[PDB]
Amino acid sequence: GVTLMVVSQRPSEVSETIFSQCSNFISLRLTNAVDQTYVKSLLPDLSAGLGDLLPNLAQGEF
Amino acid sequence: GVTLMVVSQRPSEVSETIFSQCSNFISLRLTNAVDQTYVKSLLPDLSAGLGDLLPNLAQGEFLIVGDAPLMPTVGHFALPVPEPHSRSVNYLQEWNSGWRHVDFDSVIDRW
Amino acid sequence: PAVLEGIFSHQIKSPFALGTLGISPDIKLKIDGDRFFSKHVAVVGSTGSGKSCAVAKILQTAVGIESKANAHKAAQKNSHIVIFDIHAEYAAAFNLEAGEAFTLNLLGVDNLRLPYWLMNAQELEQIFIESNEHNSHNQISQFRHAVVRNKCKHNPTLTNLSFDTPVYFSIDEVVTYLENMNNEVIGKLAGEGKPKLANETLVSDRDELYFDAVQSFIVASQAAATKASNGPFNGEFDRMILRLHTRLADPRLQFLFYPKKEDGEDLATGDFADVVRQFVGYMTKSNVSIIDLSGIPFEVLSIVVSLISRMIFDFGFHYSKNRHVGGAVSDVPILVVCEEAHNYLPRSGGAAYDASRKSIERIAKEGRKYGVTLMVVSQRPSEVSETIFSQCSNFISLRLTNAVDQTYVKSLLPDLSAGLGDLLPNLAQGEF
Amino acid sequence: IGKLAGEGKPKLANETLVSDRDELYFDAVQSFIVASQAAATKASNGPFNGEFDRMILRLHTRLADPRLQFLFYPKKEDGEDLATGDFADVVRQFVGYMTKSNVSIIDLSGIPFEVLSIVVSLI
Amino acid sequence: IGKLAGEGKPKLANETLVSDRDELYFDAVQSFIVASQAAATKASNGPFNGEFDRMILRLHTR
Ligand SMILES: Nc1ncnc2c1ncn2[C@@H]1O[C@H](COP(=O)(O)OP(=O)(O)OP(=O)(O)O)[C@@H](O)[C@H]1O
Ligand SMILES: [Mg+2]
């Protein structure tokens, strides 16, 4: 009976050993590219058709 | 609080491990094709859309990309002040002169 | 055409003519030489393409020649050039008529002076010695020891000497020393642990005696009456002594081992200067110097090329420094020409073709600052050390047919639009 | 080294045995007896006798070069060698007074082409 | 090694000096007196003591 909830805006600095356990994921606009690469290296259901919206996202969308 | 300002004119020989960490990018006239290819490969926004512009850039014109600006964009610099100089030799001039004399001994003294 | 003229003639800083256009021969082509000569250059092509007959044109234009008519007869202007020729081809171009008064230095196997006491260790080990041996270590150690002893003796005033300090030292004396060591015999009596001579005398310092002449050691007999044993370095130097006796006996190397001056006397330390001004032209006041290598053996080419390039770089350095003390720069610029680079500048080789590379590599990098520039020539760039070609700025090319070279080149040249990489094989003879 | 009873120590040309080198060798060079099979005065060669010549030569060579005095014989304004109590004055010729924004330039044309990467990594 | 006078060698636990290693060691193992700092029994370790452990373990293992 215990959970977690991580937050960050510079994930490239965070440890992967932990992100390798979360099940559901959320995301908003990402401009830098290093992140984008790190991210796309992890997520389980990222079709290429979705890997392009990340920098094109408006204000308030997710 | 430590950051870099890498410069070069022939990237394909540099360790990609580094170019894979810079956020903003700037470029100018780039004729060779291998470099165009490498660059294009690095960046999606710089797809065939604009990469076709590089070899036709004037002098004092640049192309910028990254998170800092508002959008991919082109620019035109102005001359800086004071300019940098190198103080090198001019063969063609020193040769239309006469013929010189030398004190070889003096030189050997240092040698 | 008027436009083309107004462009290619009247919009440039330091006009240097090069020729004409491939379209309109009633037009000329001019460029900025201040950048063309002040940096490193490269030329390539294939056989029958017309390279040498273009290099020669360039140089003739540089020193101010046209139609076998020296324009600067009254005044010899400033220009300093050194050429590494092999096939002995360029002596004809500059061989003007006495009525034109174009002095020219010219060397190569019989009027050359380039002794053996100007080297470092590597070169000496390469010349005098091989390394197919177990006890090579102690042999070489004795060699170096004797060398240093001979230097110290012949030049006592100084200190801090090694196996590399360039100063007079004899060789026959070294050989004599080694022979006496290889015939040595030590006494083994009470108070006789020392070389025993035929006159039954004990030697104090080998270095004091050995170098003059040979001696007469007694039998190495453990008989108590004359208990003596053979020198610890006896009968272990045959191969080396033999190879040396051979080398020195060779008659194709008297320009090196026994380089006599015009007087007919042997060279010494006080002549280290005159050795140089010939490589430059300040002995006869000629703007040019040529080095013929055809009439030279097959083993010792790189050594020479390294020695020479080294002694040029050093002059440039020191003179520019003395001149800069005055708040200025060198007014004695220098140009060097290296042909058939694929021979003594291989892309990949053993130790044989090692030295040259360094002595040249250096120039490629630093020369531009001290007034020393290169000009490379070849037809097989794919066999040259990329390290060097990487450094040149302006390039020239002629007809190319092979493909491995087309590719290797296109990998480098900056302004190579795709529309031109296809011309090369379809180039005429005399077009560039 | 000696090869007789009670002679399991390096032997000196003065016919003396060495106790410990960590105190002796750094002082200067020393003379050694001859390697003889004489049972009365016997001697042999150490394990590193005739194996360190080239390594020694390279150093005797480099140390002479004047183009490297800034690296082997650096001297202070007083004209003295550096010690372990000036580590900071070094750094400060790159940074120079945290406040009052500073600029630092380096010129590598003069340095040879064999130590460049080293210099860079150090800084 | 005994740090005493004229004893710059190893000293057996039974207080005997070492002349030729190559004649003794191969035969079997040997025990030496302690490296006691006592001026009477002054002695330090060897130059190679406490380094050949895993390289000696692997062998008996194989
Ligand atoms: N401007 C020119 N017009 C026509 N022909 C020329 C011109 N210049 C040179 N040639 C011809 O080129 C030939 C000389 O070729 P060259 O010796 O330069 O070849 P190369 O580069 O030395 O080839 P390789 O090194 O393989 O011998 C001459 O026979 C000459 O007829
Ligand atoms: Mg030719």
PDB file of N, CA and C in Angstrom, chain C residues 40 84 120 122-123 126 301-310 313 336 338 340-367 374 376 383-389 391, chain D residues 113-114:
ATOM      1  N   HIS C  40      49.757  26.651 -47.321  1.00  0.00           N
ATOM      2  CA  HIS C  40      50.166  25.368 -47.863  1.00  0.00           C
ATOM      3  C   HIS C  40      49.297  24.992 -49.054  1.00  0.00           C
ATOM      4  N   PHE C  84      63.154  19.457 -54.156  1.00  0.00           N
ATOM      5  CA  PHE C  84      63.611  18.078 -54.008  1.00  0.00           C
ATOM      6  C   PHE C  84      63.326  17.344 -55.316  1.00  0.00           C
ATOM      7  N   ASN C 120      70.719  13.066 -34.749  1.00  0.00           N
ATOM      8  CA  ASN C 120      70.280  12.590 -33.454  1.00  0.00           C
ATOM      9  C   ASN C 120      70.503  11.083 -33.393  1.00  0.00           C
ATOM     10  N   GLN C 122      68.299   8.354 -33.335  1.00  0.00           N
ATOM     11  CA  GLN C 122      67.528   7.565 -34.292  1.00  0.00           C
ATOM     12  C   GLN C 122      68.254   7.372 -35.620  1.00  0.00           C
ATOM     13  N   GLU C 123      68.695   8.473 -36.230  1.00  0.00           N
ATOM     14  CA  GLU C 123      69.347   8.388 -37.533  1.00  0.00           C
ATOM     15  C   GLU C 123      70.621   7.559 -37.461  1.00  0.00           C
ATOM     16  N   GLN C 126      69.917   3.959 -37.163  1.00  0.00           N
ATOM     17  CA  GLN C 126      69.417   3.465 -38.439  1.00  0.00           C
ATOM     18  C   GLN C 126      70.559   3.214 -39.413  1.00  0.00           C
ATOM     19  N   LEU C 301      67.723   7.869 -48.110  1.00  0.00           N
ATOM     20  CA  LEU C 301      67.056   9.043 -48.665  1.00  0.00           C
ATOM     21  C   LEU C 301      66.320   9.846 -47.590  1.00  0.00           C
ATOM     22  N   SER C 302      65.487   9.165 -46.801  1.00  0.00           N
ATOM     23  CA  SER C 302      64.677   9.846 -45.798  1.00  0.00           C
ATOM     24  C   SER C 302      65.549  10.588 -44.801  1.00  0.00           C
ATOM     25  N   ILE C 303      66.657   9.969 -44.400  1.00  0.00           N
ATOM     26  CA  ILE C 303      67.576  10.594 -43.457  1.00  0.00           C
ATOM     27  C   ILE C 303      67.977  11.975 -43.951  1.00  0.00           C
ATOM     28  N   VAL C 304      68.439  12.041 -45.198  1.00  0.00           N
ATOM     29  CA  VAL C 304      68.872  13.306 -45.776  1.00  0.00           C
ATOM     30  C   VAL C 304      67.724  14.304 -45.786  1.00  0.00           C
ATOM     31  N   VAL C 305      66.554  13.860 -46.246  1.00  0.00           N
ATOM     32  CA  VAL C 305      65.435  14.789 -46.376  1.00  0.00           C
ATOM     33  C   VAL C 305      65.049  15.373 -45.023  1.00  0.00           C
ATOM     34  N   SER C 306      65.175  14.571 -43.968  1.00  0.00           N
ATOM     35  CA  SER C 306      64.850  15.047 -42.631  1.00  0.00           C
ATOM     36  C   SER C 306      65.894  16.034 -42.152  1.00  0.00           C
ATOM     37  N   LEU C 307      67.166  15.664 -42.263  1.00  0.00           N
ATOM     38  CA  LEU C 307      68.228  16.555 -41.827  1.00  0.00           C
ATOM     39  C   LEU C 307      68.024  17.934 -42.436  1.00  0.00           C
ATOM     40  N   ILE C 308      67.818  17.967 -43.751  1.00  0.00           N
ATOM     41  CA  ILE C 308      67.734  19.234 -44.467  1.00  0.00           C
ATOM     42  C   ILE C 308      66.538  20.052 -43.991  1.00  0.00           C
ATOM     43  N   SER C 309      65.343  19.453 -44.022  1.00  0.00           N
ATOM     44  CA  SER C 309      64.159  20.187 -43.590  1.00  0.00           C
ATOM     45  C   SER C 309      64.317  20.729 -42.173  1.00  0.00           C
ATOM     46  N   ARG C 310      64.902  19.929 -41.284  1.00  0.00           N
ATOM     47  CA  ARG C 310      65.178  20.371 -39.922  1.00  0.00           C
ATOM     48  C   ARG C 310      66.044  21.622 -39.903  1.00  0.00           C
ATOM     49  N   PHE C 313      63.956  24.726 -41.072  1.00  0.00           N
ATOM     50  CA  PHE C 313      63.044  25.176 -40.028  1.00  0.00           C
ATOM     51  C   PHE C 313      63.776  25.949 -38.938  1.00  0.00           C
ATOM     52  N   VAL C 336      59.302  25.571 -50.276  1.00  0.00           N
ATOM     53  CA  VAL C 336      59.866  24.238 -50.414  1.00  0.00           C
ATOM     54  C   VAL C 336      58.983  23.444 -51.362  1.00  0.00           C
ATOM     55  N   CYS C 338      58.195  19.464 -52.686  1.00  0.00           N
ATOM     56  CA  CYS C 338      58.343  18.037 -52.434  1.00  0.00           C
ATOM     57  C   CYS C 338      57.552  17.274 -53.485  1.00  0.00           C
ATOM     58  N   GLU C 340      56.842  13.541 -55.846  1.00  0.00           N
ATOM     59  CA  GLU C 340      56.664  12.102 -55.678  1.00  0.00           C
ATOM     60  C   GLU C 340      56.556  11.743 -54.202  1.00  0.00           C
ATOM     61  N   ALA C 341      55.704  12.490 -53.503  1.00  0.00           N
ATOM     62  CA  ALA C 341      55.584  12.332 -52.062  1.00  0.00           C
ATOM     63  C   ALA C 341      55.230  10.905 -51.672  1.00  0.00           C
ATOM     64  N   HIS C 342      54.545  10.174 -52.547  1.00  0.00           N
ATOM     65  CA  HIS C 342      54.104   8.825 -52.214  1.00  0.00           C
ATOM     66  C   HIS C 342      55.269   7.870 -51.985  1.00  0.00           C
ATOM     67  N   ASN C 343      56.500   8.333 -52.194  1.00  0.00           N
ATOM     68  CA  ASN C 343      57.668   7.494 -51.949  1.00  0.00           C
ATOM     69  C   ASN C 343      58.196   7.667 -50.529  1.00  0.00           C
ATOM     70  N   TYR C 344      58.535   8.900 -50.149  1.00  0.00           N
ATOM     71  CA  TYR C 344      59.117   9.173 -48.842  1.00  0.00           C
ATOM     72  C   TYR C 344      58.132   9.842 -47.893  1.00  0.00           C
ATOM     73  N   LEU C 345      56.844   9.780 -48.195  1.00  0.00           N
ATOM     74  CA  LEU C 345      55.818  10.266 -47.286  1.00  0.00           C
ATOM     75  C   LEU C 345      54.631   9.316 -47.315  1.00  0.00           C
ATOM     76  N   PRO C 346      54.867   8.020 -47.144  1.00  0.00           N
ATOM     77  CA  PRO C 346      53.791   7.042 -47.313  1.00  0.00           C
ATOM     78  C   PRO C 346      52.652   7.259 -46.332  1.00  0.00           C
ATOM     79  N   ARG C 347      51.460   6.838 -46.754  1.00  0.00           N
ATOM     80  CA  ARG C 347      50.315   6.813 -45.857  1.00  0.00           C
ATOM     81  C   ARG C 347      50.513   5.817 -44.726  1.00  0.00           C
ATOM     82  N   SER C 348      51.311   4.779 -44.956  1.00  0.00           N
ATOM     83  CA  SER C 348      51.478   3.710 -43.977  1.00  0.00           C
ATOM     84  C   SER C 348      52.782   2.990 -44.270  1.00  0.00           C
ATOM     85  N   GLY C 349      53.711   3.026 -43.320  1.00  0.00           N
ATOM     86  CA  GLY C 349      54.987   2.358 -43.496  1.00  0.00           C
ATOM     87  C   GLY C 349      55.626   2.075 -42.158  1.00  0.00           C
ATOM     88  N   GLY C 350      56.722   1.327 -42.213  1.00  0.00           N
ATOM     89  CA  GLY C 350      57.457   0.947 -41.023  1.00  0.00           C
ATOM     90  C   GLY C 350      58.279   2.096 -40.487  1.00  0.00           C
ATOM     91  N   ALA C 351      59.421   1.759 -39.892  1.00  0.00           N
ATOM     92  CA  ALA C 351      60.303   2.791 -39.369  1.00  0.00           C
ATOM     93  C   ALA C 351      61.138   3.431 -40.468  1.00  0.00           C
ATOM     94  N   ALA C 352      61.418   2.692 -41.544  1.00  0.00           N
ATOM     95  CA  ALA C 352      62.239   3.216 -42.626  1.00  0.00           C
ATOM     96  C   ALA C 352      61.844   4.641 -42.980  1.00  0.00           C
ATOM     97  N   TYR C 353      60.589   4.834 -43.361  1.00  0.00           N
ATOM     98  CA  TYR C 353      60.090   6.159 -43.713  1.00  0.00           C
ATOM     99  C   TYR C 353      59.355   6.789 -42.534  1.00  0.00           C
ATOM    100  N   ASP C 354      60.070   6.915 -41.416  1.00  0.00           N
ATOM    101  CA  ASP C 354      59.541   7.597 -40.241  1.00  0.00           C
ATOM    102  C   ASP C 354      60.053   9.029 -40.146  1.00  0.00           C
ATOM    103  N   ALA C 355      61.374   9.186 -40.031  1.00  0.00           N
ATOM    104  CA  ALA C 355      61.981  10.476 -39.736  1.00  0.00           C
ATOM    105  C   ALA C 355      61.377  11.595 -40.568  1.00  0.00           C
ATOM    106  N   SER C 356      61.488  11.467 -41.891  1.00  0.00           N
ATOM    107  CA  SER C 356      61.011  12.506 -42.794  1.00  0.00           C
ATOM    108  C   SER C 356      59.682  13.062 -42.314  1.00  0.00           C
ATOM    109  N   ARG C 357      58.707  12.175 -42.114  1.00  0.00           N
ATOM    110  CA  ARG C 357      57.366  12.602 -41.746  1.00  0.00           C
ATOM    111  C   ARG C 357      57.406  13.672 -40.665  1.00  0.00           C
ATOM    112  N   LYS C 358      58.018  13.369 -39.520  1.00  0.00           N
ATOM    113  CA  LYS C 358      58.077  14.366 -38.460  1.00  0.00           C
ATOM    114  C   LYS C 358      58.665  15.662 -38.992  1.00  0.00           C
ATOM    115  N   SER C 359      59.902  15.588 -39.485  1.00  0.00           N
ATOM    116  CA  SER C 359      60.597  16.770 -39.969  1.00  0.00           C
ATOM    117  C   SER C 359      59.763  17.557 -40.961  1.00  0.00           C
ATOM    118  N   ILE C 360      58.799  16.911 -41.605  1.00  0.00           N
ATOM    119  CA  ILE C 360      57.895  17.569 -42.530  1.00  0.00           C
ATOM    120  C   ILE C 360      56.597  17.955 -41.846  1.00  0.00           C
ATOM    121  N   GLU C 361      55.997  17.011 -41.121  1.00  0.00           N
ATOM    122  CA  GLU C 361      54.759  17.287 -40.405  1.00  0.00           C
ATOM    123  C   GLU C 361      54.849  18.613 -39.669  1.00  0.00           C
ATOM    124  N   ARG C 362      55.916  18.785 -38.893  1.00  0.00           N
ATOM    125  CA  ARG C 362      56.167  20.027 -38.181  1.00  0.00           C
ATOM    126  C   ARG C 362      55.913  21.239 -39.067  1.00  0.00           C
ATOM    127  N   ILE C 363      56.626  21.305 -40.192  1.00  0.00           N
ATOM    128  CA  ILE C 363      56.501  22.442 -41.101  1.00  0.00           C
ATOM    129  C   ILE C 363      55.046  22.692 -41.455  1.00  0.00           C
ATOM    130  N   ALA C 364      54.308  21.623 -41.753  1.00  0.00           N
ATOM    131  CA  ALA C 364      52.923  21.766 -42.178  1.00  0.00           C
ATOM    132  C   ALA C 364      52.132  22.628 -41.214  1.00  0.00           C
ATOM    133  N   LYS C 365      52.473  22.564 -39.933  1.00  0.00           N
ATOM    134  CA  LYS C 365      51.693  23.191 -38.875  1.00  0.00           C
ATOM    135  C   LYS C 365      52.218  24.580 -38.528  1.00  0.00           C
ATOM    136  N   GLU C 366      53.497  24.668 -38.172  1.00  0.00           N
ATOM    137  CA  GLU C 366      54.065  25.885 -37.616  1.00  0.00           C
ATOM    138  C   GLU C 366      54.739  26.777 -38.647  1.00  0.00           C
ATOM    139  N   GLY C 367      55.178  26.218 -39.772  1.00  0.00           N
ATOM    140  CA  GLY C 367      55.929  27.005 -40.733  1.00  0.00           C
ATOM    141  C   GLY C 367      55.239  28.293 -41.127  1.00  0.00           C
ATOM    142  N   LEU C 374      55.159  25.155 -47.965  1.00  0.00           N
ATOM    143  CA  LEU C 374      55.315  23.908 -48.691  1.00  0.00           C
ATOM    144  C   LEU C 374      54.635  23.973 -50.049  1.00  0.00           C
ATOM    145  N   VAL C 376      53.323  20.503 -52.281  1.00  0.00           N
ATOM    146  CA  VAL C 376      53.301  19.061 -52.453  1.00  0.00           C
ATOM    147  C   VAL C 376      52.927  18.752 -53.889  1.00  0.00           C
ATOM    148  N   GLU C 383      47.743   7.370 -51.304  1.00  0.00           N
ATOM    149  CA  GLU C 383      48.869   6.712 -50.657  1.00  0.00           C
ATOM    150  C   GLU C 383      49.693   7.685 -49.827  1.00  0.00           C
ATOM    151  N   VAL C 384      49.218   8.912 -49.663  1.00  0.00           N
ATOM    152  CA  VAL C 384      49.897   9.910 -48.872  1.00  0.00           C
ATOM    153  C   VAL C 384      49.231   9.990 -47.504  1.00  0.00           C
ATOM    154  N   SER C 385      49.907  10.632 -46.557  1.00  0.00           N
ATOM    155  CA  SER C 385      49.405  10.741 -45.194  1.00  0.00           C
ATOM    156  C   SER C 385      48.360  11.848 -45.138  1.00  0.00           C
ATOM    157  N   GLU C 386      47.094  11.455 -44.966  1.00  0.00           N
ATOM    158  CA  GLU C 386      46.003  12.420 -44.864  1.00  0.00           C
ATOM    159  C   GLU C 386      46.339  13.570 -43.927  1.00  0.00           C
ATOM    160  N   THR C 387      47.112  13.295 -42.877  1.00  0.00           N
ATOM    161  CA  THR C 387      47.515  14.301 -41.906  1.00  0.00           C
ATOM    162  C   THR C 387      47.944  15.588 -42.592  1.00  0.00           C
ATOM    163  N   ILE C 388      48.625  15.454 -43.725  1.00  0.00           N
ATOM    164  CA  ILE C 388      49.260  16.585 -44.384  1.00  0.00           C
ATOM    165  C   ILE C 388      48.262  17.261 -45.312  1.00  0.00           C
ATOM    166  N   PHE C 389      47.749  16.510 -46.288  1.00  0.00           N
ATOM    167  CA  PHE C 389      46.741  17.055 -47.191  1.00  0.00           C
ATOM    168  C   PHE C 389      45.651  17.798 -46.435  1.00  0.00           C
ATOM    169  N   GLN C 391      45.952  19.891 -44.228  1.00  0.00           N
ATOM    170  CA  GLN C 391      46.372  21.224 -43.818  1.00  0.00           C
ATOM    171  C   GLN C 391      46.437  22.224 -44.959  1.00  0.00           C
TER     172      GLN C 391
ATOM    173  N   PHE D 113      53.554  20.726 -31.035  1.00  0.00           N
ATOM    174  CA  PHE D 113      52.356  19.974 -31.382  1.00  0.00           C
ATOM    175  C   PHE D 113      52.347  18.581 -30.764  1.00  0.00           C
ATOM    176  N   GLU D 114      52.946  18.431 -29.583  1.00  0.00           N
ATOM    177  CA  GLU D 114      53.016  17.147 -28.904  1.00  0.00           C
ATOM    178  C   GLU D 114      52.435  17.163 -27.497  1.00  0.00           C
TER     179      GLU D 114
END
